[PDB]
Amino acid sequence: ALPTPHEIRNHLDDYVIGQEQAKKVLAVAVYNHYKRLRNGDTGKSNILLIGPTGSGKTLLAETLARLLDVPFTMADATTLVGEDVENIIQKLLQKCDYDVQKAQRGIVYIDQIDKISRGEGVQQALLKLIEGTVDTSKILFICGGAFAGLDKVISHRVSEGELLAQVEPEDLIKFGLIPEFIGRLPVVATLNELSEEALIQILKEPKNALTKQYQALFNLEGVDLEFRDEALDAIAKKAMARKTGARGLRSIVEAALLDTMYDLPSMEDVEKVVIDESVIDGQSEPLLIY
């Protein structure tokens, strides 16, 4: 039984924060794609994700795959080679037990599509798959990307989110994509820039959140790691100022706990408390409790 776009967006709220509009657009696009497949046809319903780095694009594509127990595989548009284009396919079969049908129900995420925008040979080569020649007609294609200059071209025609909403196929044309490639991506879902509160929730809520990991790394040391809310907010701010999105959270946390993890096993105390001054300033050492 296929989950309604409601059940899909609902389950997406359990992994990705915000981007509600992008999760509605994806839910509908996904439901329509598998609803069209389970009825043997009689639109390709392929997807183009347009959002900043660390917005949750790749996470969304992987989540959709799990929620539908469907074989999923990634790929970078930078590593693209015509015989390497089918390599993505064999990888989908590898994680599909080499089942032709279940592999046709699969989802394929292509990262950094905005990077190959003239390169044009890759667009046309990968274009052969999107259409279909196992047949690649059945599988869903999700093309992520940051599209930097895109925010400019759209403005030259019409916040960053309000501008990305007025996105048009002609805008992607001027950006560097070819017509025949854009016509294969009818569904365009745009994600907004993550705020601070979302980032803080990413550091806490998820079952694999950074804090939980380090609290577990410090836990097997016999030490209790405590992240004060001020410290988490500081990390969020530290990440935004670097525009690294949620991808630049670990690079902050590691740098903050570096010294402490170094001379931790050579100490004997109860717990270590990380304050905001430890993050922002980076000068002050973390609180130590014996």
Ligand X SMILES: Nc1ncnc2c1ncn2[C@@H]1O[C@H](COP(=O)(O)OP(=O)(O)OP(O)(O)=S)[C@@H](O)[C@H]1O
List of residues contacting ligand X (CB under 6 A) = 16-19, 53-59, 111, 144, 146, 179, 183, 194, 202, 206, 245-247
The answer to the question of whether 176 is labelled as a binding residue is no
Distance of alpha carbon 214 from alpha carbon 278, whole angstroms: 15
Judge whether 273 and 226 are in contact, CB under 8 Å: yes
> Which window, 11-19, 50-58, 194-202, 276-284, contacts its own copies (CB under 8 A)?
50-58
One symbol per residue from 106 to 135: x for binding its own copies (CB under 8 A), - otherwise; what is it?
-----xx-----x--x-xxx--x-------
| Cα end-to-end span (Å), the chain | 56
The answer to the question of whether 59 is labelled as a binding residue is yes
The answer to the question of whether 82 is labelled as a binding residue is no
Question: Which residue is listed with tokens 């284009």?
Answer: 85
Of 47, 50, 55, the closest CA to residue 31 belongs to 47
Which one of its own copies, ligand X, none is in contact with 57 (Cβ closer than 5 to 8 A by kind)?
ligand X
Which one of its own copies, ligand X, none is in contact with 93 (Cβ closer than 5 to 8 A by kind)?
none
Site for its own copies in 201-220 (CB under 8 A): 207-208, 210, 212-213, 215-217, 219-220
Which one of ligand X, its own copies, none is in contact with 246 (Cβ closer than 5 to 8 A by kind)?
ligand X
Distances (CA, A) of 91 to 58, 71, 103, 131, 260: 17, 10, 10, 19, 41
Per CB under 8 A, the list member of 13, 14, 66, 94 interacting with its own copies is 94
The answer to the question of whether 56 is labelled as a binding residue is yes
Which one of its own copies, ligand X, none is in contact with 283 (Cβ closer than 5 to 8 A by kind)?
none
Question: Which residue is listed with tokens 């969304």?
Answer: 60
The answer to the question of whether 52 is labelled as a binding residue is yes
Backbone gaps in the chain, preceding residues (C–N over 2.5 A): 42, 80, 118, 133, 158
Query: Please, which residue, 121 or 179, has the CB nearer to ligand X?
Result: 179
The answer to the question of whether 132 is labelled as a binding residue is no
Distance of alpha carbon 45 from alpha carbon 47, whole angstroms: 7
Judge whether 38 and 102 are in contact, CB under 8 Å: no
Distance of alpha carbon 49 from alpha carbon 64, whole angstroms: 13
Distance of alpha carbon 146 from alpha carbon 6, whole angstroms: 27
Which one of ligand X, its own copies, none is in contact with 137 (Cβ closer than 5 to 8 A by kind)?
none
Distance of alpha carbon 148 from alpha carbon 41, whole angstroms: 36
Per CB under 8 A, the list member of 86, 168, 271, 276 interacting with its own copies is 168
Which one of its own copies, ligand X, none is in contact with 10 (Cβ closer than 5 to 8 A by kind)?
none
Tell me if 229 contacts its own copies by CB under 8 A. no
DSSP class of 76: B
Structure tokens at 142: 């999700």
The answer to the question of whether 53 is labelled as a binding residue is yes
Tell me if 170 contacts its own copies by CB under 8 A. yes
Tell me if 78 contacts its own copies by CB under 8 A. yes
Per CB under 8 A, the list member of 95, 100, 119, 222 interacting with its own copies is 95
Amino acid sitting at position 240: M
Distance of CA 127 to the CA centre of its chain: 22
Per CB under 8 A, the list member of 15, 91, 240, 273 interacting with its own copies is 91
